[PDB]
Amino acid sequence: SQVVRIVGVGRTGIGKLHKSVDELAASALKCALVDANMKQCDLQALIAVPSLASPQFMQAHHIATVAGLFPTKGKFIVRTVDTGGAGPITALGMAVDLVRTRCAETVAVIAADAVLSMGSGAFAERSNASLRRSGLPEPCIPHGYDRYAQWYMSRYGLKREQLAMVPVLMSKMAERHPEAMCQKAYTLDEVLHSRCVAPVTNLLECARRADGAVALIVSGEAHYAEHFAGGSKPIIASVAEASGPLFPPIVPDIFSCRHAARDAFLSANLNVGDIHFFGLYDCFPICLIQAVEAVGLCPEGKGGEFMETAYNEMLNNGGVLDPSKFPINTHGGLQCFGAPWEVPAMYNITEAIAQLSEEAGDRQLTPVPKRALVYGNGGIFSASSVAILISD
Amino acid sequence: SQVVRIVGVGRTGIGKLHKSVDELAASALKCALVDANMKQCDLQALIAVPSLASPQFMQAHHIATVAGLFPTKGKFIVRTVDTGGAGPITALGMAVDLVRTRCAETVAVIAADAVLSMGSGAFAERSNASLRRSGLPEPCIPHGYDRYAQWYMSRYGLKREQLAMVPVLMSKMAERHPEAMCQKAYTLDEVLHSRCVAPVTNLLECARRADGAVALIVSGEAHYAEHFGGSKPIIASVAEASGPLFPPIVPDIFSCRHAARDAFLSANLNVGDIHFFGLYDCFPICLIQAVEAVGLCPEGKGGEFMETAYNEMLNNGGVLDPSKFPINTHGGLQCFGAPWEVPAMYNITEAIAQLSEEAGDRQLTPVPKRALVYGNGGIFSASSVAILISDL
Numbered sequence A: 001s002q003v004v005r006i007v008g009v010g011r012t013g014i015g016k017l018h019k020s021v022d023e024l025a026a027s028a029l030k031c032a033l034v035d036a037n038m039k040q041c042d043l044q045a046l047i048a049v050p051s052l053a054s055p056q057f058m059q060a061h062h063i064a065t066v067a068g069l070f071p072t073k074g075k076f077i078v079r080t081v082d083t084g085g086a087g088p089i090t091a092l093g094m095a096v097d098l099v100r101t102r103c104a105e106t107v108a109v110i111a112a113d114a115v116l117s118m119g120s121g122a123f124a125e126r127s128n129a130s131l132r133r134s135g136l137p138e139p140c141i142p143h144g145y146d147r148y149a150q151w152y153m154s155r156y157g158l159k160r161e162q163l164a165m166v167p168v169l170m171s172k173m174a175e176r177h178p179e180a181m182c183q184k185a186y187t188l189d190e191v192l193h194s195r196c197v198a199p200v201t202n203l204l205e206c207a208r209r210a211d212g213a214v215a216l217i218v219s220g221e222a223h224y225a226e227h228f229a230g231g232s233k234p235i236i237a238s239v240a241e242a243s244g245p246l247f248p249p250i251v252p253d254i255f256s257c258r259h260a261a262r263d264a265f266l267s268a269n270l271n272v273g274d275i276h277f278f279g280l281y282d283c284f285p286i287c288l289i290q291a292v293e294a295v296g297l298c299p300e301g302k303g304g305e306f307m308e309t310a311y312n313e314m315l316n317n318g319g320v321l322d323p324s325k326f327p328i329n330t331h332g333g334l335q336c337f338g339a340p341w342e343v344p345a346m347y348n349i350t351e352a353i354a355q356l357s358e359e360a361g362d363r364q365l366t367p368v369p370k371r372a373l374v375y376g377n378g379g380i381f382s383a384s385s386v387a388i389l390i391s392d
Numbered sequence B: 001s002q003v004v005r006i007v008g009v010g011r012t013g014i015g016k017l018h019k020s021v022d023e024l025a026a027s028a029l030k031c032a033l034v035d036a037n038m039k040q041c042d043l044q045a046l047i048a049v050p051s052l053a054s055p056q057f058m059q060a061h062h063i064a065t066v067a068g069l070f071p072t073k074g075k076f077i078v079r080t081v082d083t084g085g086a087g088p089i090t091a092l093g094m095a096v097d098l099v100r101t102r103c104a105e106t107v108a109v110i111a112a113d114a115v116l117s118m119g120s121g122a123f124a125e126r127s128n129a130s131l132r133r134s135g136l137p138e139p140c141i142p143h144g145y146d147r148y149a150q151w152y153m154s155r156y157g158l159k160r161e162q163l164a165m166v167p168v169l170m171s172k173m174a175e176r177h178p179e180a181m182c183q184k185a186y187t188l189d190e191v192l193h194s195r196c197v198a199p200v201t202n203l204l205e206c207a208r209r210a211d212g213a214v215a216l217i218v219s220g221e222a223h224y225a226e227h228f229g230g231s232k233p234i235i236a237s238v239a240e241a242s243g244p245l246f247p248p249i250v251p252d253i254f255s256c257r258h259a260a261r262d263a264f265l266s267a268n269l270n271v272g273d274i275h276f277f278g279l280y281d282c283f284p285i286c287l288i289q290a291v292e293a294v295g296l297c298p299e300g301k302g303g304e305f306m307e308t309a310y311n312e313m314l315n316n317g318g319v320l321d322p323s324k325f326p327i328n329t330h331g332g333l334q335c336f337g338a339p340w341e342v343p344a345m346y347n348i349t350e351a352i353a354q355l356s357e358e359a360g361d362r363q364l365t366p367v368p369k370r371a372l373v374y375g376n377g378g379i380f381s382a383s384s385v386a387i388l389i390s391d392l
């Protein structure tokens, strides 16, 4: 096949940054190049995902032009891809493909957005407009996921309080991350008594609006060692995708994460027991609950109980959530770290790399994980992208 | 490695159709499935390009959902890609890649838009907004290409009248195509005396706004024969290259030559083996650069290539013989129609018509065995080239 690694990582801060999407993208890319010990001229491709704050025709080309990558010497392949929040991992798979087919020896993958700075009114309008023809009441995306949550409750007996436990657990993780937007952990009642957004979905269960950008540099192992030289630059062991409808009608074969996860495991010749860090998309509680089931951390229908077990162990440990007992989204995820539209799957990757390189600080897993699984989700369970990262 | 064919083609009409983008996409896909002797359930992937008339989050997913592809039984991979008007050929390359890596045995590639029905005011605003930060005066895209045209005139001695000859030649082709929006050929003076859009670019030299959709079905040769020549051509190769989204000017900015060269090497063919060319012609300078890039004439001689054909046309009783100018026999973006990111599809469909001997009064004799198609995005920002052959 040929071994391909994430050789560079760079990102901006997260929050209300008062910067343009182009500035954030450019800053993230520069950080990534420094992290890779590379220069602009060493890049042979660039892949990006669209922005909601600043929608732009041929986004990747726009970013590349403004950042001053042109004119280049030799070949440069640029591409914008849209699979929603699955994008960054989708783009990762494409980057691997460009390397293996020898279309490009090195690839930059960039995601950038500013949905907190854009204002609540504009965000709500554009995010709702994203689900035309769905029949979903506003806000549409939360209502779409809420409809799947209610189906889980009816089908599998998922409890309302088990959904609400997700942001509690994520807030416990987030408060150990210096940059996470949530710096104080929630109580279960606080989540349950927060503003109602949809019948079984409250405000503190919604993905947290943020500005932010992340850039990844992908390269063949051999090429990188020759010119620019484990866990800090992990091997992309596999990437797999699967898809579903953009909005709900409900049958279990609609969900695509399990198929994507299974294909990623087979591709990498690994199993769930070999993975000791999980960066799992958590735009709403039902997404994370379905994710842990899909990747095989627990049986089908037992995701809610998986959350409750961790929540109870947290309460019986003096309110402390031990990462070793819940090695998932140690950064806080979309719930409590932040969610810049199609960006935040990048934070599953960056947090995985931090853990694999033993640079996650107070969030650090012990023993150091050798292998990580990351998961990005787009639309309303419409796009699944799963990748497995290994140190060696 | 493994032979992959375009096994189905379907499209709507072209013009002012008064239909939604979703309706056009859905209609084109149904036609393509019938043309492939396939059903929805036989599709394992769908790739699409964004629409200007109806911009939509996760466009491919949106189209797939509204068209009723879900729920699916097996795996289904959906993806939206944006490389401007290069898109359809970019997507074609990705489809081939999905087949070869066995992620999907069959792939639908769809492009749909309605930029004529959307209204002149909305089109102008959105097309201009596409070039933020460029510094180009309105209309921005024509002015961007106009700046490159002026550079060609200064650098290579390209004549103003040679630019204007492009729509003349395209209008001669278009009037032989029943559905082409231009049904009466232009004179050179008529082009030169038409409304000025940019210093060296007039109205009849601009890409013709149209509504339209096209859908392609891609499949491995062996898989298709088990379950379901020129009419279903082999995708011999696909190659891409990119450049800045807008101008500052150096010759290494242009990427079509690199893309063309890589496609030829990939396919193990040369320009002399190709007897039909579907070349992107959003403005005269694009086609002039295209014929040079693919090797139909030397660098800087594209203007003279047009004049030679124009003069031979005048000395042949005003008749443009396709055998002496086997290029865009449909009329291209200039005179067939240009639905934003769609019209590279018409280079593919016209190529297939020629290869299958179903091009009517436009038919090349002898029947071409091999065709080259070229899509261009932005302002010489994206190049996508593919070579189609009837048999090995």
Ligand SMILES: CC(C)(COP(=O)(O)OP(=O)(O)OC[C@H]1O[C@@H](n2cnc3c(N)ncnc32)[C@H](O)[C@@H]1OP(=O)(O)O)[C@@H](O)C(=O)NCCC(=O)NCCSC(=O)CC(=O)O
Pocket (backbone or CB within 6 Å): A083, A084, A085, A086, A120, A124, A127, A139, A141, A142, A197, A203, A204, A205, A206, A207, A208, A209, A283, A334, A335, A339, A341, A342, A377, A378, A379, A380
């Ligand atoms: C919930 C909303 C309808 C309305 O929230 P508002 O922005 O109006 O709230 P606000 O900022 O005005 O003020 C509310 C107060 O609570 C805080 N607050 C706001 N949102 C919060 C959240 N998610 N979690 C925790 N706290 C939050 C604010 O800081 C503020 O605090 P104080 O007042 O104390 O300062 C909206 O945020 C929304 O639509 N959220 C859903 C996001 C979404 O759908 N994302 C895409 C998921 S799909 C995906 O992930 C990928 C893909 O694109 O496919």
Ligand SMILES: CC(C)(COP(=O)(O)OP(=O)(O)OC[C@H]1O[C@@H](n2cnc3c(N)ncnc32)[C@H](O)[C@@H]1OP(=O)(O)O)[C@@H](O)C(=O)NCCC(=O)NCCSC(=O)CC(=O)O
Pocket (backbone or CB within 6 Å): B083, B084, B085, B086, B120, B127, B139, B141, B142, B197, B203, B204, B205, B206, B207, B208, B209, B282, B334, B338, B340, B341, B376, B377, B378, B379
């Ligand atoms: C030329 C324009 C500025 C002006 O268009 P208007 O809508 O104002 O046209 P109008 O109102 O003057 O039209 C009045 C008459 O002229 C005709 N007419 C209109 N446009 C024409 C054209 N291009 N060629 C020939 N005739 C044309 C109409 O049929 C009508 O006929 P009658 O006389 O019978 O009434 C615009 O169409 C334009 O921007 N065109 C270029 C589009 C573009 O840049 N596309 C992207 C290219 S880049 C690319 O392709 C790559 C990528 O996408 O990335």
